[PDB]
């Protein structure tokens, strides 16, 4: 029979995958950690023979067809190997995307806007990002943003417009509608019963969401609205759209730097636990073997000897070259690692149990079939890794730990404080990801022609996002191109959806371990039940429906806002009396 | 009669998925004066008092030996799960059982030091839908056994007989060695008296 024989190739590309991936993860690690040029050209080598290898292999897979094959993990695994991708390209065309594709990367990290009063400052993407992210001048924040649109977004107009028509022919030629369509069959499956999703259900789904969150959205605008207007007189207007450039950072994407300007009361003084760290004598083994204990005390495994031998926690004394970036490494043959350079502070107390959570994640389907050796959908391990951090920050559990006197006290200021700082930073970010993906959206599937580029973008910013440019786009521009992910070839709607799930999980672990009160005071330590069933969630791999996955923890198989405006509840109530009736 | 305990003091100490087991039945053992041959470091006994090990008719001892090193103390601790529980040994607790782990002095010169400790990450068969693991039974061996025994050269290096996958992980000794015993006691019980 064909599923016997694809039974058997399945067994030994495992059996010869599971080799090859090592050797060229351990390549790369060994690069990452120690930056020269055999590393690097060890790194190239490895990486060569495992492209070689699935290559090679992916076009064995095409013997087998899909219509005589039934069980659903053979199947899963065969959808894998046979995709084509940018192969389909007609060989010119290929090169020509590459071309482009490069292009524009080096275009976005070589950007360089100077002073228009001073051309002998001139400033590249970093420092230009520190000035936006400090400053609260009005035209010395002006300038840098029409600068940065101007100089680095108005140069990949032209080769966007490529891009999109060559990203639509490899996606029609791979059996798609558009290249948008392309990117939303991440979140397709199959299922028996209620258990199936569609890329044309996606749209609906995520317009219905953002309609949900909405309402709270408008309040925090508002409040924000009203303190921008003290902090920049004369240049907001009472009930109008937010200038774009006003917003903390370039583009807008994070509020979480207006907290300055819109803490509630700074007479009251936020959690620090630095100073006390340092008192203490904590270290980066003292870290991560209190994220261990963390972990260990709701019921998930420890770490394996060689995590510890083999992890590189702090930046070393040898002066070696290190990439320097909080990573989490799965590499193979149950070898699992850490890259951060730590120090004694809060931030890499919360990424520590970050990273321990997506190696948690990484150990708990350590036995499912390679292809399957993935989060169930593109949102599920980010989520994963954030509902820790959430538990992780309360005072309860500082407390606990004694990282803070217990006779700390508690009252609603504080909490209104921190509910706060978590709105900039969470749900002001959401209205940002809706419409950049919808203009994306549109883009690719041709609704917005390329006459009408920004006239829409800007639009959708005073529909969706309620922003309003500082000046006027002609044509020649391209604003969302300026961004990362956009030039970049991302794919943005990852952060739309690992919030969406992030709190849906979290009260799921918070019904389980009995808690009583807001939800915002929720600590899942010291609760194997809780643990129980997100492991039991953890270890299904890819090798279920994602809707499925998502029953096995919150008990639905559908994505709900309800429990995100569940948390921000005692904040929403708080907004809407100091606001009043300026809320639009 | 006594019994000697120079096959456990000489040689280089096997590693621990290879560990070797010494059986004993009439003999008047002594064994205050084996421990006194290295530096104990732990001694942790279940089901007997570390004293009362020492006396005491017993029907039958056993010593499993092998190279560990002494700073894995909490991998091999019971209610731990992992590669050194499943894959290398598990340690019974149906007889009365001490662990002991202790370095090596330089006195001894009769015990010879092996290259690396070593033992073994996974072991398992393999099939389209994943990684069905095999586990140790309480005091066995591992079914990896035969193809562990063709040696590591490098950490996470795996051997293949088309069914059974093995990888085992090294690193190299430093120091002194350090070495783990396990000492079970099982009760006709007049055998083995001290
Ligand atoms: C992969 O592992 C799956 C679940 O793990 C096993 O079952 C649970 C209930 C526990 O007993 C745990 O210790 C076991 O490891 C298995 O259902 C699945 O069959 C495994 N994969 C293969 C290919 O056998
Ligand atoms: C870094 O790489 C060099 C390349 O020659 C190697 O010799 C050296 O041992 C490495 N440093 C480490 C592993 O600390
Ligand atoms: C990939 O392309 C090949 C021809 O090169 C074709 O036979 C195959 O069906 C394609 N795969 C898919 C999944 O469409
Ligand atoms: C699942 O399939 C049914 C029947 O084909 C369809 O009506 C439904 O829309 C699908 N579910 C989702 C969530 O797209
Ligand atoms: C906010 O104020 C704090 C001091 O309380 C300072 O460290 C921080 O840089 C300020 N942030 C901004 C964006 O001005
Ligand atoms: C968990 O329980 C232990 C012992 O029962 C206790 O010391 C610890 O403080 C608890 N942790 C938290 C976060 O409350
Ligand atoms: C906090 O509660 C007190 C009474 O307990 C109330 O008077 C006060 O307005 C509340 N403050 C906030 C910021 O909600
Ligand atoms: C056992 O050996 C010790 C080693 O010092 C010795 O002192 C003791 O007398 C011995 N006990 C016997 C032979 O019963
Ligand atoms: C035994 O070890 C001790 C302490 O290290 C040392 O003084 C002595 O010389 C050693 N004896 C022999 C015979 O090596
Ligand atoms: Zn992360």
């Given at each position: 029979?064909?599923?016997?024989?694809?039974?058997?190739?399945?067994?030994?590309?495992?059996?010869?995958?599971?080799?090859?991936?090592?050797?060229?993860?351990?390549?790369?690690?060994?690069?990452?950690?120690?930056?020269?040029?055999?590393?690097?050209?060890?790194?190239?080598?490895?990486?060569?023979?495992?492209?070689?290898?699935?290559?090679?292999?992916?076009?064995?897979?095409?013997?087998?067809?899909?219509?005589?094959?039934?069980?659903?993990?053979?199947?899963?695994?065969?959808?894998?190997?046979?995709?084509?991708?940018?192969?389909?390209?007609?060989?010119?065309?290929?090169?020509?995307?590459?071309?482009?594709?490069?292009?524009?990367?080096?275009?976005?990290?070589?950007?360089?806007?100077?002073?228009?009063?001073?051309?002998?400052?001139?400033?590249?993407?970093?420092?230009?990002?520190?000035?936006?992210?400090?400053?609260?001048?009005?035209?010395?924040?002006?300038?840098?943003?029409?600068?940065?649109?101007?100089?680095?977004?108005?140069?990949?107009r032209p080769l966007y417009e490529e891009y999109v028509e060559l990203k639509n022919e490899m996606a029609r030629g791979?059996?798609?509608?558009?290249?948008?369509?392309?990117?939303?069959?991440?979140?397709?499956?199959?299922?028996?019963?209620?258990?199936?999703?569609?890329?044309?259900?996606?749209?609906?789904?995520?317009?219905?969401?953002?309609?949900?969150?909405?309402?709270?959205?408008?309040?925090?605008?508002?409040?924000?609205?009203?303190?921008?207007?003290?902090?920049?007189?004369?240049?907001?207007?009472?009930?109008?759209?937010?200038?774009?450039?006003?917003?903390?950072?370039?583009?807008?994407?994070?509020?979480?730097?207006?907290?300055?300007?819109?803490?509630?009361?700074?007479?009251?003084?936020?959690?620090?636990?630095?100073?006390?760290?340092?008192?203490?004598?904590?270290?980066?083994?003292?870290?991560?073997?209190?994220?261990?204990?963390?972990?260990?005390?709701?019921?998930?495994?420890?770490?394996?000897?060689?995590?510890?031998?083999?992890?590189?926690?702090?930046?070393?004394?040898?002066?070696?070259?290190?990439?320097?970036?909080?990573?989490?490494?799965?590499?193979?043959?149950?070898?699992?690692?850490?890259?951060?350079?730590?120090?004694?502070?809060?931030?890499?107390?919360?990424?520590?149990?970050?990273?321990?959570?997506?190696?948690?994640?990484?150990?708990?389907?350590?036995?499912?079939?390679?292809?399957?050796?993935?989060?169930?959908?593109?949102?599920?391990?980010?989520?994963?890794?954030?509902?820790?951090?959430?538990?992780?920050?309360?005072?309860?559990?500082?407390?606990?730990?004694?990282?803070?006197?217990?006779?700390?006290?508690?009252?609603?200021?504080?909490?209104?404080?921190?509910?706060?700082?978590?709105?900039?930073?969470?749900?002001?970010?959401?209205?940002?990801?809706?419409?950049?993906?919808?203009?994306r959206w549109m883009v690719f599937e041709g609704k917005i022609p390329k006459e009408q580029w920004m006239e829409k973008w800007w639009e959708m910013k005073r529909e969706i996002v309620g922003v309003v440019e500082p000046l006027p786009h002609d044509e020649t521009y391209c604003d969302p191109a300026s961004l990362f992910h956009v030039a970049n070839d991302y794919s943005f709607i990852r952060y739309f959806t690992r919030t969406i799930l992030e709190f849906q999980f979290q009260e799921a672990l918070c019904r389980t371990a009995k808690h009583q009160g807001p939800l915002h005071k929720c600590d899942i330590s010291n609760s194997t039940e809780a643990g129980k069933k997100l492991n039991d969630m953890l270890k299904l791999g890819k090798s279920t429906p994602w809707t499925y996955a998502l029953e096995?923890?919150?008990?639905?198989?559908?994505?709900?806002?309800?429990?995100?405006?569940?948390?921000?509840?005692?904040?929403?109530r708080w907004l809407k009396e100091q606001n009043g009736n300026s809320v639009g | 009669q006594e019994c000697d305990f120079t096959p456990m003091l000489t040689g280089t100490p096997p590693p621990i998925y290879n560990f070797k087991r010494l059986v004993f039945t009439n003999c008047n053992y002594n064994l205050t004066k084996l421990l006194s041959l290295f530096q104990v470091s732990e001694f942790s006994c279940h089901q007997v008092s570390p004293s009362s090990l020492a006396t005491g008719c017993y029907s039958s001892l056993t010593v499993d030996y092998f190279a560990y090193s002494t700073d894995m103390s909490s991998y091999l601790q019971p209610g731990s799960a992992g590669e050194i529980v499943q894959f290398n040994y598990k340690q019974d607790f149906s007889n009365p059982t001490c662990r002991v782990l202790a370095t090596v002095p330089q006195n001894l010169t009769t015990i010879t030091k092996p290259s690396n400790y070593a033992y073994l990450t996974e072991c398992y068969k393999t099939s389209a839908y994943g990684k069905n693991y095999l586990y140790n039974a309480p005091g066995g061996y591992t079914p990896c056994l035969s193809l562990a025994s063709r040696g590591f050269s490098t950490k996470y290096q795996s051997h293949s007989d088309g069914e059974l996958t093995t990888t085992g992980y090294i690193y190299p000794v430093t120091g002194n060695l350090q070495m783990a015993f396990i000492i079970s006691v099982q009760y006709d019980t007049n055998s083995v008296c001290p």
């Open positions: 029979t064909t599923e016997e024989e694809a039974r058997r190739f399945l067994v030994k590309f495992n059996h010869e995958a599971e080799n090859l991936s090592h050797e060229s993860a351990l390549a790369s690690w060994d690069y990452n950690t120690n930056i020269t040029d055999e590393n690097a050209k060890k790194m190239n080598e490895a990486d060569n023979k495992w492209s070689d290898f699935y290559k090679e292999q992916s076009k064995i897979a095409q013997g087998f067809p899909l219509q005589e094959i039934k069980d659903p993990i053979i199947k899963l695994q065969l959808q894998i190997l046979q995709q084509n991708g940018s192969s389909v390209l007609t060989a010119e065309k290929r090169k020509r995307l590459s071309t482009i594709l490069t292009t524009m990367s080096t275009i976005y990290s070589t950007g360089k806007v100077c002073n228009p009063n001073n051309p002998q400052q001139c400033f590249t993407l970093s420092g230009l990002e520190d000035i936006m992210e400090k400053s609260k001048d009005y035209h010395e924040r002006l300038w840098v943003w029409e600068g940065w649109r101007s100089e680095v977004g108005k140069q990949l791979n059996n798609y509608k558009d290249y948008g369509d392309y990117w939303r069959g991440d979140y397709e499956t199959e299922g028996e019963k209620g258990y199936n999703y569609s890329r044309n259900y996606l749209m609906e789904d995520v317009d219905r969401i953002f309609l949900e969150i909405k309402p709270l959205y408008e309040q925090l605008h508002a409040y924000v609205r009203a303190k921008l207007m003290k902090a920049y007189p004369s240049h907001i207007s009472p009930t109008g759209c937010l200038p774009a450039h006003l917003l903390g950072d370039m583009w807008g994407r994070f509020w979480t730097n207006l907290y300055n300007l819109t803490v509630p009361l700074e007479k009251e003084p936020n959690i620090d636990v630095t100073d006390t760290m340092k008192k203490q004598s904590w270290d980066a083994e003292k870290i991560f073997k209190e994220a261990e204990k963390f972990y260990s005390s709701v019921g998930l495994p420890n770490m394996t000897p060689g995590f510890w031998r083999d992890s590189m926690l702090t930046e070393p004394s040898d002066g070696r070259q290190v990439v320097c970036h909080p990573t989490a490494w799965d590499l193979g043959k149950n070898d699992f690692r850490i890259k951060m350079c730590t120090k004694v502070t809060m931030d890499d107390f919360l990424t520590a149990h970050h990273e321990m959570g997506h190696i948690q994640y990484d150990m708990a389907y350590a036995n499912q079939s390679y292809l399957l050796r993935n989060g169930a959908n593109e949102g599920f391990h980010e989520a994963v890794g954030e509902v820790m951090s959430l538990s992780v920050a309360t005072p309860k559990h500082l407390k606990g730990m004694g990282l803070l006197p217990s006779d700390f006290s508690e009252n609603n200021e504080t909490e209104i404080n921190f509910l706060l700082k978590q709105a900039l930073t969470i749900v002001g970010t959401l209205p940002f990801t809706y419409m950049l993906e919808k203009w096995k923890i919150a008990e639905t198989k559908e994505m709900d806002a309800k429990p995100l405006l569940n948390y921000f509840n005692p904040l929403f | -």
